[model samples]
Target chain A: MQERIKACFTESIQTQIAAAEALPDAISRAAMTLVQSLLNGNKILCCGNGTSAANAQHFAASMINRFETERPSLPAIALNTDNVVLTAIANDRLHDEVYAKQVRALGHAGDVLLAISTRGNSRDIVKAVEAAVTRDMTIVALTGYDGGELAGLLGPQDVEIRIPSHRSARIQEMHMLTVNCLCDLIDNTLFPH
Target chain B: MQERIKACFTESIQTQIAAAEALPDAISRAAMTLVQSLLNGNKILCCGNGTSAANAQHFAASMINRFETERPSLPAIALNTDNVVLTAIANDRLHDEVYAKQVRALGHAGDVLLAISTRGNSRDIVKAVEAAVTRDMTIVALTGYDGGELAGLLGPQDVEIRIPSHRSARIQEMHMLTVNCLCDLIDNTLFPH
Candidate 1:
């Protein structure tokens, strides 16, 4: 049982790493997009659903606080953590508008919005993406699989980092690493502490 | 410049995946511990610092919500999320006691405490481990590198899921994956969701 457990897990891990290595160009572009937004003194607005919502929160926390090195605070907000606003939005308006309303209210042009969806098609985050576009914000999307609706929404102006995995666990693993890379990249480029 | 970034980042990803493949037993054991706790009608409490703190929040939210399927909510709380308590605790007592104090307050003998630290040497989380020990909670520690001080605190009955990596980002990536795996295992076993 243990060996079977380890064997399939090993296969999954292998798939994630291979996909991660193969998609350096997209990942690089995503990192650069985050860095540029910070350089422009703009905030990063993050949105996701369920586990991806937590990843969005994780990304914001890492930036607002510090990733590894001691650095000045970077402006970032996770749209998922605001229970009051989220619940209000869901109750008063449509649940899909929870993140979208926040983006329209908070985001401005030159700001970067990170949209995380492990399978790429899960929840209300796509509404948030459309709202980010409406605000002329730079969208750095972290997605997996065929990229779902998020993949179709991207144009030349936005950054699309689609991790090559259909598996939820594997895609999430890649997403965590991608955010860490973003933190490292942004910290080194801007803060360097 | 982009090439160098991609190369090093890819290397980091590779190292992380390698380390993940190396620790299936610990990950499996961690999952089992969480399952056992849920089966015994106990909650899983999580705590970490910085990036790991975000991870703790992610882990708890996944349990309290859902992993992939729609299911009944599981009882899990991230001790690090309460800003009001955290700030008050830091001001009145010690910052180290923030997590520990909460663990002592909420944790009982049958519950599981997921103590996460990338390098295994975070200051605040160590106190949490101590408090968990005092309450006789099952310590499911997700640590990295040599496991540092957190590794020493675990007894024979404890589940220490240590990822094999020295890199902070890599270790954190493993920690997230490990927890997600645990959630999947627990949900599938307990609720089939």
Candidate 2:
């Protein structure tokens, strides 16, 4: 049991190392895009499906609260944070329109859409991305495994930090680190000490 | 900018490596507690504040959906998933009772409380721990930085996977990996395909 747990930790470390080598530049560009959007007085609207939904909230919390050092609250919204709205949209309308409806209502042009996905193609996330594009929002897509169908949806103004691995667990783990990088970079860029 | 982003990734890897050495045993014990609770027909009640709240949802999603494999949904709930309940509690009652009220309403004895707090001292989490203890639930605390006041509240049956870091981002990043470990361990123990 102990060895199994230890091996899991070790495997996570190895996957992160590969991600560090492959994704830093793309993550940096995404961070810059987010920073630019914030500077332009636009908020970030983020969403994802299961674990990715949690990741979306994680990013929003870091921005709204504090990442490392004390700083002013940044404008960001996790489209998945409101379960009331979520269930209503999924119940009253299509499940795929859950995030899409939110994006159409809350998202504005020049705002950033931080689209997170492990499979790169959840229907809800794809819909959200399309709505964000219709709103003229720049996308910072965090995806993995050939970027799925969602990869094809991103335009030149957008950035996708696709993890090198195909495993969902490894991809999500790497996505966590990517979020940390985004938070850290945004902090340093905006509030340099 | 690129160098700063790379540095953040490197620092995260180093923090995770340290966590790997120090936390495997505690994490293993915590995983066992969760497994036992699930096997005994009890559910996990997870809660946290901010990024930790997202993590609570992350763990819950991994259990309720598929972690690494397709399986029947395990019984688990993220206390922060319902904004209606949260805002109602916070508006009508005290903000600290947000999770405690849910614990009283939803928790059963023998259930596990996966209380995540990066600070280890958030008032909401501390209140939730007290409520869980009163309900005879075992705790699996994911905390950091000397374990804060929340550390003192743990009982003998409880397991605390405290990350060995003082930095909030590092602690939360490590917490992300810890959640992954718990999910992977639980999947392996229960399904073992």
Candidate 3:
């Protein structure tokens, strides 16, 4: 039983490393920019659908509530918790506009928007990225499956971290690792030993 | 603008019979049962610490995800989104029964635990409800305050529905009204009429 657990951990870490290796230099730089923005007291907004939504919320909680050491909670919003807003928006407009509507409501210049999607081509995810760009909010896309159309839209300022796995489960697992590692790195960088 | 927005809804609901008040007894009973179970599902796991932890994931989302509608998708699990689990279980093995510790291995028992927390006195809510009593399958209490610990301890077969109030924000606002009214009754039930 112990060995089985160890094997899972080992496999997970290996997958994470490979995923991180696939990330572009510009994406790493964008992550650094996000860390700087948070250091300056700016907020981070995260959103996705289904499992990705859980990932978004998990990322926010890790950053805002501390990972390993005690520190002041950073500002982060999952953007999917408010059901009233989500359902109201989905009912009034297209479901694809849910995240975009939220971005319009709560985002501002210099804030960071972390959008997660396994396929990276969900209309809603694309719409959210577009809305964030219009508001001058930084866009960080963690995507898989050819990074879909989103990979083509990445500019110098925007970051697209693509995990080259075609399998949805593998992509999601790597996404969790990358985000958690990013959180740990940010925590250490901001409050170094 | 914000004040006006708040006032419109508040006054309309206050001056008239609130929609919840107008709900038929049967519908109300079913809605309460569904929500109570979801809440119990959360409390049974005994994870989630602060606000994020307290409001387990599916408890709220399930209400909006078609709890009793045709082909319901009530797959709500509040795994430790908070990082406290790693540290707590790592250092304090006694308390290490982190959510994952119990959930990953034993989530089957909570299949219907989702609808059991209305009156708030769910034994599962406090992590004291024994899974063994019901052969680890029965749906337990769903009540408001104090869940009559005596009754919860009595056994798992007892269905406790404790209605605390109609005004308390936490109890009133967060219970299972949203999905009950929207999809289950209005969309499906009323459609046949």
Candidate 4:
């Protein structure tokens, strides 16, 4: 049992590293742009559906709190955290409008939008990305399984990190690891003690 | 602007009908059974820190899932959606035994554990709830003051609900509605719906 668990962990990490390696320079440039946005003091706004939503919240906590180091709280918000806002938007408008509405309300130019979707095909996420684009916000997507429509919509300057896994669990695992890695890099680069 | 935003939604639900008062007697009876063992089809596990942790996951989702209704999915696990497990556990074992350890290993008894937290205390949360719980599993939690701990712990249950209010947003609001009213009754009665 221990060996099996170890194997699962090993496979999970290996798969994530491979997925990271597959992204082209275009995606890297987009990630760099996102980092630059954070450096400028604009907050990172993250959103998604279901488990992806959890991932967004996790990433936001790491940003505003800390991943592995002590530092001043960075400004970041998980647009998915408020149930009142989510249900209100879903009940009042289209459910797809939930994240987009938040983006419109809270997002500003030069802010960063990190949108997560395993399938990369959620309509609400797509709408949010478009809304961010309209507001001149930098957009980054974390997706898997063909990268769905996100791969097609992201421009050269926008980052869309896609993991090739087809299974939802695998995709979610890699997505989480990637976000943590980015958080670690940010902490090390900006707050090196 | 911040105060206005805070107060606009701070309006409490008042009708002499507490949140527990709003619940049917059948649910109330079933809630108590869950506190004991939750039908024994599965083990009841909860993962939230502070006050939320005290209630655990079974009281929130499983009672609603299996009581008076059809025998829906059994086994509930609450993932401490906060970061306690990954960080604090990494530092010391005393803290590590809190959530994820029990969850990741023993979570298969039935398949659910209700996780809760008001402030969404960080260390216990990250280590316990999210790490061990799965979808075939059920999780329910009462969260307040930001839903910080319960943010990521949502899933299909016999019934799952959140009391709407921030920490200060609805202190009396939750006590009257969620705790004293809804959960208290859930603890005593088993009416057939």
Candidate 5:
């Protein structure tokens, strides 16, 4: 049991190292896009599925509240955390439209969609991306494992910070690190020392 | 900007190193406790605030769905994800009773309460602890920074996996690592080779 647990930490560390070596540039670009969107008086709309949905919620919480330092709340909504909106859309519309319909209603052209998917292939996430694109929102996708279908849908204007991992657990671990980095970067950019 | 993002990943790795050194035994014990509760037909009720709330949701999602390997869904509930219940309680009752009320209604005596707080100080989480103790439910707290007020509320039977970090962001990063570790450990224990 101890060995199994130790391996989990080790793999997580290794994943972070790989991400650090590979993703700084894309993450920086994504942060710039988010910062620019906020400066333009536009909000962020984030969405994902299952564990990734929690990641989206964490990102919004950090942005709308505090990440590291105290600052005024930024405009960010986690599309999946609102059970009423989510269940309403999922019940009345297609399950794939859960996030898409929210994007249509709440998202604007200058807004940024922070789309998180471990494998980048969840049908709901792909649909969210399509809706974001239709709304003219810039996408900052976090994905892994060959960048799945969500990765394939990105345009030159979109930024994809795809982690170099195959395992979903390791991918999600690195995704949290990426989320923290973005939060810290966004904080420093908006509220500089 | 690159340096700032790089520092975030570096600090995350260092925190993981510290946690891997200090937390394996406690995490393993927590996993055993959770495994026992699940085996006894009792579900896990998880709760937190803000980003920690997302962590609780992630834990519950992984349990009720999958972690790494394929297995039958385990019984787990994230108390904070229900928007209606949360707002209803926060409106009619004290804001802190959001999770406490859920614990009172859904938690059984032998069930496990997975309370996550970066500082162990959120009033709502502390309230949840108080309610869980009243119901005779065991607690497995994930906390950091000297294990704030919530730590003081724990009994001998409850397990607290405290991360060694003063910064809330770093503490949350370690908490995710700890959460992933616990999930992996739990999965291995219940569906082993």
Candidate 6:
């Protein structure tokens, strides 16, 4: 059982890792995009749900804090992390617009929207993507499971980095690597060290 | 500037990957420990702060939902996810005991604790570790940056999986990988998938 457990887990992680190793081009492009947006004085916005929501917070925190290097803190915010905003919107208005409304208000042209959904089917995140598109922001989607409906919404200027898996665990495993790649590339492009 | 960020980020990731590649044995051992605890019908409790706190919720959500499979939900809770518990504890007591107080109330012998601290210095996490110790639960710690003060609290019976990095991004990158590994291992061992 010990070996079986280890083997199965390793198989999942190994498969995802291989998928990540092949995504450098897409990942690099995303990083470059974030760098340009930041240089243009626009902030990055993100939204997700459940596990992906947790990731939005993690991503935003890293950008606001430090990713891997000591650079000045960057401007990044996750729409899902604010308890008041999330609860108030979910309770009073409609749960669907929690992210979209934020995008409509806080987002603008040339800003980067890090729209994340593990299976790419989370309704709020999809709405957030729609809001970002309507606001003329560049969309950088992180997704899994055939890219879901969120995948169908991307335009030419948007980027979709699907983790080539249907399993949430596998998808998210690779997703974090993609996160690492983009943030690194973004920071690297901006700070050069 | 871009390349600089990239190099530092890349260095952090690559170095940690090497450390991870060398850690499968200890990781596998920790997985076995958790699997045994679960088999004995004990639940898993997790605690962290900030981004790591978000990860605590993600970890519990993946287990309570389904990490990568359609298997039945497991018994797990993130002590940090409940806003009431967090706010009440932080407001009434010192912030450091937020996790420890919950452990004293809910934890018992034979349960498991997944203690996470990116800098290896989160105060609440250290308190949670100490509380978990007093309650006779198994501890599986995830840490980085020289393992900080939280490192000393881990005893011989505990498992400490340090991510071999000083950067929070790099450490958490591998921390999620390690979380994925344990969940998969636990799922596979319990369900034979």
The lDDT leader among the candidates is 5
TM-score top scorer: 5
Measured against the native two-chain assembly using Cα atoms, what DockQ does each of the candidate structures obtain, in the order listed? 0.48, 0.74, 0.03, 0.03, 0.78, 0.35
- Alpha carbon lDDT at A175, candidate 4: 62
Encode model 4's per-residue lDDT on B113-148: one tens digit a residue: 555555544756644556545524455454555556
Cα lDDT, model 4, residue B50: 29
Which residue runs of candidate 2 sit more than 4 Å off their true CA positions?
A: A92-94
Clashes of each: 0, 0, 17, 41, 0, 10
Off by over 4 Å in 1: A191-193, B13-21, B69-72, B187-193
Estimate every model's Cα lDDT from 0 to 1: 0.80, 0.87, 0.55, 0.58, 0.88, 0.79
TM-score per candidate, in order?
Answer: 0.90, 0.94, 0.55, 0.56, 0.95, 0.84
Per-residue lDDT of candidate 2, residues B1-193 (tens digit):
7888778778878988898889888999999999999999999999988878877888888899767778999999999877678888888649889999999988899999999997788898999999999999999999998999999999889999999888777887788788887888898999998
Candidate 3 on B116-168: residue-level lDDT in tens? 34344333333433432333533333334554452445343434433344422
Residue-level lDDT of model 1, residues A37-109, one tens digit each, is 8888999999988767777887988888777788788899998887778778778647779988899999999
Of 2 and 6, which scores higher on TM-score?
Answer: 2
lDDT of 4 by residue, A63-112 (tens): 77676679988888988867777778888647888888888888888898
Which whole-number lDDT from 0 to 100 does residue A65 have in model 5?
82
Q: Give the candidate order by descending TM-score.
A: 5, 2, 1, 6, 4, 3
Q: Give the lowest summed-lDDT range of ten residues in model 6 chain B.
A: B1-10
Note the B-chain TM-score for every model: 0.93, 0.97, 0.26, 0.49, 0.96, 0.92
